[PDB]
Amino acid sequence: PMFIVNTNVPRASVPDGFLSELTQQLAQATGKPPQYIAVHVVPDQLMAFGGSSEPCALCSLHSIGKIGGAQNRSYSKLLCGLLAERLRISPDRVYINYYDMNAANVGWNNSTFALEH
Amino acid sequence: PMFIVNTNVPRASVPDGFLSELTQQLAQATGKPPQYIAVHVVPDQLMAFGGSSEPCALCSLHSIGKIGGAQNRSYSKLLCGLLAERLRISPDRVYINYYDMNAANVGWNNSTFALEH
Amino acid sequence: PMFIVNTNVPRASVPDGFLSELTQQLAQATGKPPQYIAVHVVPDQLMAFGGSSEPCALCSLHSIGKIGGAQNRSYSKLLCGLLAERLRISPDRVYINYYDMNAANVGWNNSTFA
Ligand SMILES: CCc1cc(=O)nc2[nH]c(C(=O)c3ccccc3)cn12
């Protein structure tokens, strides 16, 4: 899985330990091994939410499976909680786009995750 | 809705009020309220279009509904118009990827927009 | 088509010619003229792969068609090869998301490709 956060919160406000916390908490939430979790944090961005430049975040989570109604609401609670606690971003100024990726459409290690045919 | 612009145009060439203008124009175009519109502009990018590093932009528009053949042609005219006028980027050096998002696949405010089941 | 690379490799480590090599190799690989290909390289990123911040990359390739099982495995070999050779990133620390775009959902030059 891969999780990206783009935010106008300054780099200096991203706490030590943040990428590792995301890595471990997403491993737990998705049931996938930590070794396969990638995280990407992009501070200092020029962005607005609702026309306001108060702290906000635009995020993406890509996973092969483990994407769906109840699961995505769970991820949102988890990830909004982290963004609120660590970056002081209000949950109602966060968007997270969820993508259920087909194994054939994710490349890795010179191939993809579709090895069957 | 979420609109992202990545461009090699320098930061100083992005006019003040560009984010607000995008916000207003997108609210009008999509019929969604401004409070739900998120905009994100990323200047000074290392990019090429057709092998040239002249001004260009790679963009995305994510919306729950209001995405389709006719509407997208209309968005492209609107957004290329703004990028050309404000950032001086030629319309034939812009790509915009449109995404019709399922409500269940967009997280916000500790949950998603799938609140029904 | 368009290709985006996000990496924690520093900008100074991105070699002269890299964007051009991606453009022409992707032209060859997708069969499209180089004039169609957009590439975007984002160095110096704050990222981790498997909990480690050794060199890694998160990438996307969007194309109207030319996306599929065998084709994507070919793109991955090509692109991982380039990232390993040029940016010294291990292939097992690269993800590439492939998107088969509908022509109606790609805007260009005041319109779409539909
Ligand atoms: C055709 C003019 C054209 C001009 C470009 O500068 N870029 C580009 N990309 C495509 C493309 O990938 C495509 C378009 C329609 C169907 C299949 C692929 C087509 N173009």
Domains annotated on chain A, with CATH = 1-117 (3.30.429.10)
Closest CA to C4 of A64, A60, A94: A60
**The residue type at B52:** S
Helices B69-87 & B18-30 angle (0-180, nearest 10): 160
Residues on chain A touching B101 (C-beta within 8 angstroms): 97
Q: What is the resolution of this structure in A?
A: 1.9
Ligand 1 in contact with C36 (CB < 6 A)? yes
Cβ–Cβ contact A106 with C under 8 A: yes
Say if CB C37 and CB C1 are below 8 A apart.
yes
Contact (CB<8Å) B96/C114: no
Give the C-alpha separation, A23 to C110, whole Å: 41
Between chain A and chain B, how many beta carbons pairs sit less than 8 Å apart?
102
Please provide residue A34's backbone torsions phi and psi, each rounded to the nearest 5 degrees. -60, -30
Residues 6+ apart with CB under 8 A from B71: none
Give the bridge partners for C52, in sequence order.
C49
Compute the distance between CA of residue C112 and CA of residue C103 in angstroms, rounded to an integer.
7
Please indicate the experimental technique that yielded this structure: X-ray
Shortest CA distance from B114: residue in chain A: A69
> Of B104, B32, B90, which Cα lies nearest the Cα of B61?
B32
Burial A4-37 (b: 16+ CB within 10 A, else e): bbbbbbeeeebeeebbeebbebbbebbebeeebb
CA angle A83, A89, A91 (to 5 degrees): 80
Q: Whose CA is nearest to atom 18 of ligand 1?
A: C64
Q: Does A66 touch chain B (CB under 8 A)?
A: no
H helix or E strand, kind and range, residue C58: strand C57-63
Pairs across A and C, CB distance < 8 A: 100
Start-to-end C-alpha separation, chain B: 22
Residues ≥6 apart with Cβ < 8 Å to C37: B50, B51, C1, C2, C3, C22, C23, C26, C27, C30
User: Residue C64 Cα, ligand 1 centroid: separation in angstroms?
Assistant: 8
B97 is in an annotated binding site: yes
Six-digit token string for C20: 């051009």
Could you tell me if A104 and A43 are in contact, meaning their C-beta atoms sit under 8 angstroms apart? Answer: no
Q: Given CA atoms A80, A85, A91, A96 in this order, what sign does their dihedral have?
A: negative
3-state DSSP assignment of residue C75? helix
State whether C75 and A101 contact (CB < 8 Å).
no
Q: What is the β-pairing status of strands B2-7 and B38-42? A: parallel
d(CA A62, CA C97): 9
How near does any CA of chain C get to the CA of A43, in Å?
A: 9
**3-state helix, strand and coil shares in percent for chain B, rounded to the nearest 5:** 40, 30, 30
Report which ligand 1 atom has the smallest distance to the Cα of C1.
12
Is the CB of C64 inside a 6 Å radius of any atom of ligand 1?
Answer: yes
Q: Which of C41, C32, C44 is nearest to C60 (CA)?
A: C41
Name the nearest CA neighbour of B101 among A58, A26, C65.
A58
Phi-psi region of A103 (alpha: psi -120 to 50; beta: other; left: phi over 0): alpha
- What are the residues whose beta carbons fall under 8 Å from the beta carbon of C3, sequence distance 6 or more? C22, C26, C37, C38, C39, C40, C59, C60, C61, C62, C79
* Cα–Cα distance, B66 to B29 (Å, whole number): 9
What's the one-letter identity of residue C35?
A: Q
Find out whether the beta carbon of C106 lies less than 6 Å from any atom of ligand 1: no
User: C35 alpha carbon to ligand 1 midpoint, in Å?
Assistant: 9
Beta-carbon-side half-sphere exposure of residue C9 (alpha carbons within 13 Å):
23
Query: Which of A48, A69, A91 comes nearest B117 by C-beta?
Result: A69
Tokens of A12: 């200096």
Contact A12/C at CB under 8 A: no
Length of chain A: 117
Tell me which chain C residue has its CA closest to the CA of residue B70: C104
Tell me if A7 sits within 8 A of A42, measured CB to CB: yes
Phi-psi region at C18: left, alpha or beta (left = phi > 0; alpha = psi -120 to 50): alpha
Cα–Cα nearest to A49, from B71, B83, B108: B108
